[PDB]
Amino acid sequence: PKVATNIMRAWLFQHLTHPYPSEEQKKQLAQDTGLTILQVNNWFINARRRIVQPM
Ligand SMILES: [Cl-]
């Protein structure tokens, strides 16, 4: 699971100005992580919320 998380973190940091994977990108991320598309989407929702959450 560390590799799965690191796959998504790496994508996220490379796309900080638009941290919203397209449908095709979600599909590739699912393949790379071994997570479902649903899990990939939920991870990104939670990541974007974490970035903006108050100190
Ligand atoms: Cl990282």
Which pair of structure tokens corresponds to residue 40? 């990939």
Experimental determination technique = X-ray
CB 8 within 8 A of CB 44: yes
Residues contacting 53, CB < 8 A, separation 6+:
none
- Distance (angstroms) between ligand 1 centre and the Cα of 16 equals 13
CATH numbers and ranges of domains, the chain: 1-54 (1.10.10.60)
List helix spans (H) across the chain. Answer: 2-14, 23-33, 37-52
Question: CA 35, CA 21: separation in Å to the nearest integer?
Answer: 15
CA distance linking residue 18 with residue 1, whole number of Å: 25
Count H helices and E strands in the chain, helices first: 3, 0
Ion ligand 1 — residues with CB under 5 Å? 9
Establish how many alpha carbons lie within 13 A of residue 33's alpha carbon, considering only the half-sphere containing its beta carbon: 24
What's this structure's resolution in Å?
2.0
- Cα separation, 31 vs 51, in Å, equals 25
Ligand 1: centre distance to CA 33 (Å):
14
